[PDB]
Amino acid sequence: AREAALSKIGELASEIFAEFTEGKYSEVVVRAEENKVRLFVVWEGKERPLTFLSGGERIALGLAFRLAMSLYLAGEISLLILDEPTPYLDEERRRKLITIMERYLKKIPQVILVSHDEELKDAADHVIRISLENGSSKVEVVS
């Protein structure tokens, strides 16, 4: 039954990761290394270690697996909240996130993305800025 679960989560993650990578990776393989979920990717018919992924591909894989888990556990994705999905000022991950925001996240009913990155504004539908002013958080609805 365990293997049945693993194969299913892998199938769901494979479709999303393939979309996020424009078909570069055909599959995400999910295994349980002594009850500790491990991921591998398939490229040109071979399973490869995650060290072969670029920084943008790593964020795409992590996001694909999370989205796969939402479908697996809840059967759909109505709301997605992400807190600082990329490391501070990581450029490569920024670009991939923007592409994912434009092509996939915009189709989810509601997404709440919390980030330090000003460059993500154009890819969002609504922008709210929160800043510490005179010791208190201040909300500015930008759009």
Partner: protein, 145 residues
């Protein structure tokens, strides 16, 4: 599930914060220290109290700055609009209501225990953390090899 509005008063750097969420991608930008992080903790308290989130229960040593910590959250799930309001007296007050007609009506006894039991049935905490909310570092954790 869809969030509509969160109001946070006297929780960490939030003196009087109101955030209205809409359809689509809602980007909340700010630099560490801004209060963007604690805004998410306040939503978690709103839905899932009691849970271990610091700075919610505080002691008072002076009347200066003395104010209740207040979190009000309006959200929707499967066509019904809900509102959970929590107040922490520096004693606690908790109410969860659903909009019926033009009136907010209690879905259960206004107590932490009753509301926590109802939420575990409406949208369990594990579904929220494992399917809806991707906390900081979770993408990294998933790629551990």
């Amino acid at each position: 599930m869809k969030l509509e509005r969160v109001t946070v008063k006297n929780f960490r750097s939030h003196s009087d914060t109101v955030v209205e969420f809409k359809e689509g991608i809602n980007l909340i930008i700010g630099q560490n220290g801004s209060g963007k992080s604690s805004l998410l903790d306040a939503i978690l308290v709103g839905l899932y109290w009691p849970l271990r989130i610091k700075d919610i229960k505080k002691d008072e040593f002076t009347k200066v700055g003395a104010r209740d910590t207040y979190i009000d959250l309006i959200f929707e799930k499967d066509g019904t609009k809900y509102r959970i309001t929590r107040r922490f007296l520096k004693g606690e007050i908790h109410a969860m209501k659903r909009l019926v007609g033009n009136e907010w009506k209690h879905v259960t006894e206004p107590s932490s225990k009753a509301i926590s039991a109802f939420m575990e049935k409406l949208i369990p905490y594990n579904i929220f953390l494992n399917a809806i909310y991707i906390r900081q570092g979770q993408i990294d954790a998933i790629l551990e090899s």
